[PDB]
Design a protein around this ligand. Structure first.
Ligand SMILES: Cc1nc(C)c(-c2ccnc(Nc3ccc(N(C)C)cc3)n2)s1
Length: 294
């Protein structure tokens, strides 16, 4: 739009490229997401528009949705840093535990809010988790999946990450729930603690087999109905489960306990965002300040 001046390519999401822009009028700076051209589906517009109402302290506010020349522009509140970069910058030392815990608690609140309104993210990842100098962390691109859909190949000619995708999605379940966001957050939680991706799969089956190698191949005992999933193959190699003490050290037992409940195979046994908030892991939760470099 003519009311925005692109300052820099802040990223390239699934539905489109994201830019840091300057409203030539208001003078406010925002992150402008342009989504590519038959005229854009009406259903999407109406769905995306509803998102303008779901406002929460831990959800990146969607200021306006601009649909001109039959193109889509999502105007979001701008934040100075994503979790990915912050992590890379913390690589040598690592993010302090008090901060990791504050971030998880805030993300969980955001999720609780979204899940209570029957809205899920479906594609949580370090790249759409934004932080500010205030010690707050926010979820970006919420509800955009129900608007369109994330494939395995992107227009940016790059590659879609499956590292945080819940097993029910990889196994073909087409009617997944809020539980998929909990799984992703769990994978992110573990990544913050170890400074290494939990399940860095390079393909769908490679992704599924890395999960299996660590948590063990799911069966009807631990996941009733798993063998009935569309893509479940009786020929899946049978891997034994591995202790969480080796999965995410030196995370304390409360943290390990919580992560374990966030990583349960059965979506129904997977702890909810609301319940996660009552976990003893957050008994001593605080809100530290990140040492950000901008
Ligand atoms: C994918 C994304 N989708 C949305 C809606 C994003 C967003 C929203 C608000 N601020 C920022 N800020 C921001 C993003 C990246 C960086 N980098 C330095 C990579 C700095 C600030 N990013 S990111």
């Amino acid at each position: 739009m003519e009311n925005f001046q692109k300052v820099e390519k802040i990223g390239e999401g699934t539905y489109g490229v994201v830019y840091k822009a300057r409203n030539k009028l208001t003078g406010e700076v925002v992150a402008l997401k342009k989504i590519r051209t038959e005229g854009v589906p009406s259903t999407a517009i109406r769905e995306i528009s509803l998102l303008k109402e779901l406002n929460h302290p831990n959800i990146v506010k969607l200021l306006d949705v601009i649909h001109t020349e039959n193109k889509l522009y999502l105007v979001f509140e701008f934040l100075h840093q994503d979790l990915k970069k912050f992590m890379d910058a913390s690589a040598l030392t690592g993010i302090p535990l008090p901060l990791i815990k504050s971030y998880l608690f805030q993300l969980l609140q955001g999720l609780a809010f979204c899940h209570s309104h029957r809205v899920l993210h479906r594609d949580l990842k370090p790249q759409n988790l934004l932080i500010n100098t205030e010690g707050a962390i926010k979820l970006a691109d919420f509800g955009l999946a129900r608007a369109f859909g994330v494939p395995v190949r992107t227009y940016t000619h790059e590659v879609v990450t499956l590292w945080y995708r819940a097993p029910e999605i990889l196994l073909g379940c087409k009617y997944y729930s809020t539980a998929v966001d909990i799984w992703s957050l769990g994978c992110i939680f573990a990544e913050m603690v170890t400074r290494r991706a939990l399940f860095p799969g390079d393909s769908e089956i490679d992704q599924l087999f890395r999960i299996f190698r660590t948590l063990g191949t799911p069966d009807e005992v631990v996941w009733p109905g798993v063998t009935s999933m569309p893509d479940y193959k009786p020929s899946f190699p049978k891997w034994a489960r591995q202790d969480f003490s080796k999965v995410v050290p030196p995370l304390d037992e409360d943290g390990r306990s919580l992560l374990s409940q966030m990583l349960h195979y059965d979506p129904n046994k997977r702890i909810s965002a609301k319940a996660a908030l009552a976990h003893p892991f957050f008994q001593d939760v605080t809100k530290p300040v990140p040492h950000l470099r901008l």
